[PDB]
Design a binder for this molecule. Structure first.
Ligand SMILES: O=C(CCC1CCCCC1)N1CCOCC1
Ligand SMILES: [Cl-]
Ligand SMILES: [Zn+2]
Ligand SMILES: [Zn+2]
Length: 576
C-alpha cells in the first residue's frame, strides 16, 4: 500500500498545496481515495466533408448519421479465485511463458527505438509542446534517468495514470514501460508462428483464412464468447502470472521489468476529472491499466491461459476448482506437454477477443474455472451453456465476419466483412482540430484505399472508393493521426497492391497468376451484399451511381486546380 504509492501521492499533494482537501462526498467505493485539487478543462467526433459529399445516399440513414453525434464498471470488484483455480492458472502461465520464450529472447527497447516511434506518429497514450520536442531535449532524458534509478532502487515518484478506457501517462513513464516490456510487441511474441493462438501482425486479409484453418480441425462448434468488461476483470492473480515473464530476463532488464509490474501495474495511482471541476487522486491494485500496446499483449497472454483452462475443464483434466490433488497437478502438466501446442492451434486470440474450436462440445457447459477466474461472459446467464457456431463464415472475430468468394478463374478468396453502415459511418468521422482541406482529403483517401484492399467485394464501397480516389489529387499521400498491417497507406497503384496482398504474398493461393484488371476481382452475391447492408436496389443509390461524376466534380472544385485521375472506368458500368 502507501509505502509504494505514498511518494507519488506526496509529490502531487504539494504542486496543489493551495487546493488539497479530503472531500467527504467522494463517489469511490472500490477505488482507494486520497485527496482532491482544483482544475478546469474537458472531445467531439468531427465530420469528414470529402467522404460525406461522396456518400450522399447515407445522409438519410440514421445508423450512419447518428455515429457522428454526441464508469459504473471501473468502480466494481472481482472476488479472489479458489485455490484449485489459482493452481491451474500458475501451472498454465509458467508453461505458456516457456513456450512463448523457446524461440524469442527478452531484451530492452532503446531510447533510439522510442525516439523513432514518436517521430513517425504512433499512439503512446502520453500527456515541451508535443512528444517530438521532449525526445529532442536532454532535460527530458534526465527526468527519465532520475525515475529509472528510482525503479532500480524499487521506488516510484512520477508514474501516475491520467484517466480519459485509455490510461494516459507522461512520456517518461511511457518510455520506462516501453524499455522494459516493448519487446513483447516489437519482437512479435504474439505472432501466430510464435504463440500458435495469436494473430499479432496479421492483417484483416489473413484473419478469415486463419479461422477457416481452425475450422478444418476435428472437434465441436466454434465458440466466440465475449467477456463483459475484460480490463475490469483482470485480478491481482492474473497480474502475478503475467509478471512471471521476468523469470526469463537477466541483469538490469529483469530489475526494470520487475519495477514496472510491482510499482505501476500491481499498485496504480490515477487522477480523474469529476465535474462536482476537481481532480480525484485514487489508487487500486487490480484491473488492467497499462499502455495500449502492452495491454494488447498481456490480454492476449491471459486470454490464451484462460481458454486452455476452459479446454482442460471440458476434457475432464481436473474435477473441481475448489482444490487440485497432487496427481491432478501432474495430469494438468502432462496435458500441456502432450497436447498444449495442439490446443493453442485450435484458437484465434486477439487481446480479449477469442475463437475456440474445442475437441468436442463439453466445452459449452465447462464454466466453473471461467466464472471463478472472473472472465464472466457477455449477454448470457452465468450458468447457461455457450451458443457455438456451426459455420466458420458466421463466427464473429475482431468486429468482422468472413466470406468465401470464388473468382471467375476458380481461385478462392477469404474476405473480411461487416455491416456496411458501420464502415461508411466510421469513414465520415475525423478526430482532433486544425484539419486543413488537404489533410481531410488525405484521410478520406486512406479510407478509400482500405476499402479497395479489404472491402472490394462490396459494390457500394468499391464505387465510393473509386469516387474518393478520383476526387483527391492523384499524388497526395494518404494520412491518419492514429496508425494489424496497413498496406493501403501508400501512393502505389492499388491494383498492384491488391495483387501483392491477395495473390503474390498470400500463402493460401497456390496459383500466382497476377490479375490484370479490377473487372477480374469479384463481388459478393447481390443478395449477400444486401444482407450485409448494401443499398443496391434503392433509387437513391442508383441516382448516386449514375451521377457520380457530378459528385466527384463538386469535391474537385472545392479542392481546386490540382492533378486528378479518373478511376471510375476501372468499373464495367463506367467503361463505355
Ligand atoms: O434493382 C435495381 C438495380 C440493382 C443492381 C444490382 C447489382 C448492382 C447494380 C444495381 N434497380 C432499382 C433502382 O433503380 C435502378 C435499378
Ligand atoms: Cl452458425
Ligand atoms: Zn515510476
Ligand atoms: Zn458480410
Amino acid at each position: 500500500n502507501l509505502d509504494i504509492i505514498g511518494k507519488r501521492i506526496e509529490k502531487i499533494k504539494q504542486e496543489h498545496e493551495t487546493s488539497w482537501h479530503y472531500d467527504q462526498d467522494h463517489p469511490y467505493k472500490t477505488w482507494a481515495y486520497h485527496g482532491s485539487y482544483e482544475t478546469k478543462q474537458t472531445a467531439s467526433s468531427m465530420v469528414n466533408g470529402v467522404v460525406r459529399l461522396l456518400t450522399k445516399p447515407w445522409d438519410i440513414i440514421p445508423m450512419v448519421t447518428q455515429m457522428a453525434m454526441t464508469k459504473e464498471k471501473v468502480d466494481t470488484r472481482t472476488q479472489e479465485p479458489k485455490e484449485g483455480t489459482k493452481k491451474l492458472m500458475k501451472i498454465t502461465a509458467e508453461w505458456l511463458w516457456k513456450e512463448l520464450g523457446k524461440k524469442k529472447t527478452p531484451r530492452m527497447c532503446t531510447r533510439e527505438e522510442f525516439t523513432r516511434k514518436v517521430r513517425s506518429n504512433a499512439a503512446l497514450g502520453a500527456i515541451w509542446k508535443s512528444a517530438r520536442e521532449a525526445v529532442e531535449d536532454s532535460g527530458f532524458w534526465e527526468l527519465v534517468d532520475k525515475e529509472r534509478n528510482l525503479h532500480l532502487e524499487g521506488k516510484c515518484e512520477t508514474c501516475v495514470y491520467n484517466m480519459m478506457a485509455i490510461w494516459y501517462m507522461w512520456l517518461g513513464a511511457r518510455f520506462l514501460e516501453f524499455e522494459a516490456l516493448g519487446f513483447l510487441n516489437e519482437d512479435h511474441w504474439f505472432s501466430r508462428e510464435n504463440s500458435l493462438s495469436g494473430v499479432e501482425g496479421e492483417g484483416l486479409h489473413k484473419l478469415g483464412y486463419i479461422l477457416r484453418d481452425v475450422s478444418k480441425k476435428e472437434g465441436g462448434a466454434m465458440y466466440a464468447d465475449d467477456t463483459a468488461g475484460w480490463d475490469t476483470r483482470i485480478t491481482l492473480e492474473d497480474l502475478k502470472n503475467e509478471e512471471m515473464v521476468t523469470n526469463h530476463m537477466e541483469g538490469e532488464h529483469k530489475k526494470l521489468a520487475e519495477a514496472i509490474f510491482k510499482l505501476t501495474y500491481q499498485n496504480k495511482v490515477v487522477r480523474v476529472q469529476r465535474p462536482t471541476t476537481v481532480m480525484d487522486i485514487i489508487s487500486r491494485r487490480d484491473q488492467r491499466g497499462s499502455g495500449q500496446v502492452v495491454t494488447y499483449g498481456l490480454n492476449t497472454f491471459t486470454n490464451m491461459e484462460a481458454q486452455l483452462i476452459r479446454q482442460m475443464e471440458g476434457e475432464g483434466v481436473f474435477k473441481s476448482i475448489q482444490h487440485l490433488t497432487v496427481t491432478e497437478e501432474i495430469a494438468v502438466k502432462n496435458w500441456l506437454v502432450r497436447v498444449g501446442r495442439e490446443r493453442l492451434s485450435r484458437m484465434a486470440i486477439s487481446g480479449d477477443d477469442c475463437v475456440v474450436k474445442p475437441l468436442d462440445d463439453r466445452f459449452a457447459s465447462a464454466l466453473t474455472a471461467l466464472n471463478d477466474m472472473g472472465k464472466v461472459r457477455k449477454d448470457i446467464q452465468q450458468w447457461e451453456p455457450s451458443r457455438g457456431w456451426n459455420d466458420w463464415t458466421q463466427v464473429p472475430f475482431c468486429s468482422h465476419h468472413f466470406h468465401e468468394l470464388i473468382m471467375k478463374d476458380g481461385r478462392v478468396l477469404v474476405v473480411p466483412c461487416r455491416n456496411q453502415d458501420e464502415l461508411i459511418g466510421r469513414a465520415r468521422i475525423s478526430q482532433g482540430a486544425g484539419w486543413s482541406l488537404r489533410e481531410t482529403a488525405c484521410l478520406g483517401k486512406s479510407y478509400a484505399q482500405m476499402w479497395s484492399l479489404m472491402y472490394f467485394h462490396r459494390r457500394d464501397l468499391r464505387l465510393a472508393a473509386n469516387a474518393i480516389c478520383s476526387a483527391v489529387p492523384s499524388h497526395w499521400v494518404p494520412t491518419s493521426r492514429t496508425t494489424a498491417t496497413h498496406e493501403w497507406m501508400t501512393t502505389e497503384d492499388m491494383l498492384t497492391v491488391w495483387n501483392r496482398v491477395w495473390i503474390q504474398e498470400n500463402p493460401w493461393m497456390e496459383d500466382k497468376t497476377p490479375v490484370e484488371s479490377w473487372e477480374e476481382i469479384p463481388y459478393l452475391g447481390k443478395r449477400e451484399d444486401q444482407w450485409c447492408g448494401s443499398l443496391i436496389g434503392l433509387t437513391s443509390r442508383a441516382t448516386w451511381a449514375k451521377n457520380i461524376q457530378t459528385a466527384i466534380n463538386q469535391v474537385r472544385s472545392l479542392i481546386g486546380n490540382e492533378e486528378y485521375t479518373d478511376y471510375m472506368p476501372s468499373m464495367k458500368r463506367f467503361r463505355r
